[PDB]
Amino acid sequence: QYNYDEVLEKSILFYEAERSGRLPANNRIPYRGDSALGDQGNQGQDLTGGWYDAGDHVKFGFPMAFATTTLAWGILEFRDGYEAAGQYNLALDSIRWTLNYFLKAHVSDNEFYGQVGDANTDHAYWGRPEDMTMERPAWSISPSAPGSDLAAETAAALAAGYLVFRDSDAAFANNLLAHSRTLYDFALNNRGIYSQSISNAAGFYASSAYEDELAWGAAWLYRATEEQEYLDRAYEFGTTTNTAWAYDWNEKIVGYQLLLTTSAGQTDFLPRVENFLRNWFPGGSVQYTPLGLAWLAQWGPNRYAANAAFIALVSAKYNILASESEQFARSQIHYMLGDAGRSYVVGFGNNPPQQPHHRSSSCPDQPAECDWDEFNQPGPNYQILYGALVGGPDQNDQFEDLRSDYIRNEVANDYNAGFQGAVAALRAIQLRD
Ligand SMILES: [Ca+2]
Ligand SMILES: [Mg+2]
């Protein structure tokens, strides 16, 4: 009913359109060029690369890392689906981009750059990333500026990256794992909330707690190394009694619960995984729009539902409530692909969103001017931002498709992270069935 190969191709193109830094010779996004080549640490350390977080040009390390961990997990679990779609090598290239940035950002054992760009001055600008001239400060976490959440999430992404790459690029993968170990030790021994230490982040990606990141990073390092000390750390900071509200960049609870249940064969966490799934299934504790979207909140409902669908499809692969998980997950992804009458994936399907809240796609082809006129103009973004999952409709399925609707027309790295893995899982089920 939907071409998952095309969805996967375009989702990876969305991430490619988010790239910062010096772009490769085989860049597939024609309107994007080199940008932010001056991004650097306080001692001149190269910090070029990474992804712009959303429709802005800030490099927010916390969601960037979580998006990478979630994408890597889906590549591991649904490799068969990526392979069948012809998108496996492109998916690896996709997250190689951010993994390389995390390596650059880890300038020493106990210092990690967690943001480049002042979000206040960045968001006051509307124009191309290639045309930026404002100062782009860089801030780090360190013993004097702890960030156990940011550091452990990045350690999780690096450990997941080690697992993804170790059978094709061992030198790269081994470097990722070494930095994962070091960053996780840093997170454990220098405790605090990264968005208190990098205060510019608190208006955008404020972390509510870091203990779930500590359990998540431990669970990933246990998968990567099989060393008992990490499994111990996962039980130390993990919960067997609380059920996650959502799976997202702030809350890792059901992520590590499921990871420990499936990869590590632990049984203590399975009841909380099943609680989460049943809370999201029809008849649970998450309201559905009339036309069938599981709608947790006005803030990126597609993101929350796609994240839950991803969790459900990993669960199904390990035969946890498989039938209900697959039906629920498929219903949510298919809503986003166009079941309610329009696609919510830019550049895909029937009547996709035309005005994503996204600077570079809002600009006409070079050398035309791009400024706030292009924010306000009432027609479609000049460039098609293939693959971007928009925030989504209100609770009554309504969607105005206006660039100024910074809630419903938002796009972001984390919006696509669970979504893309869920699509690969659905492609994989087609091979099975
Ligand atoms: Ca957290
Ligand atoms: Mg164009």
How would you describe this structure to a colleague?
The protein has 433 residues and is mainly α. The chain has a single domain, classed as Glycosyltransferase, CATH 1.50.10.10. Helix content is 49%, strand content 3%. The chain has 17 helices and three strands. Strands 1-2-3 form a three-stranded antiparallel β-sheet. Helix 2 runs antiparallel to helix 4 and helix 6 runs parallel beside helix 9. The longest helix is centred in the middle third of the chain and has 20 residues. It is globular. 55% of the residues are buried. It binds calcium ion and magnesium ion. The site of magnesium ion has 4 residues, from loops. Belongs to the glycosyl hydrolase 9 (cellulase E) family. GO terms for molecular function: cellulase activity; metal ion binding. This is Endoglucanase. Its EC number is 3.2.1.4.
Give a brief description.
Its EC number is 3.2.1.4. With 433 residues, the chain is an all-alpha fold. It has helices at residues 4-17, 61-77, 79-84, 88-105, 119-124, 148-165, 170-189, 194-197, 211-225, 228-237, 253-262, 270-280, 301-317, 322-339, 359-362, 372-376, 413-432, and strands at residues 59-60, 112-116, 138-141.
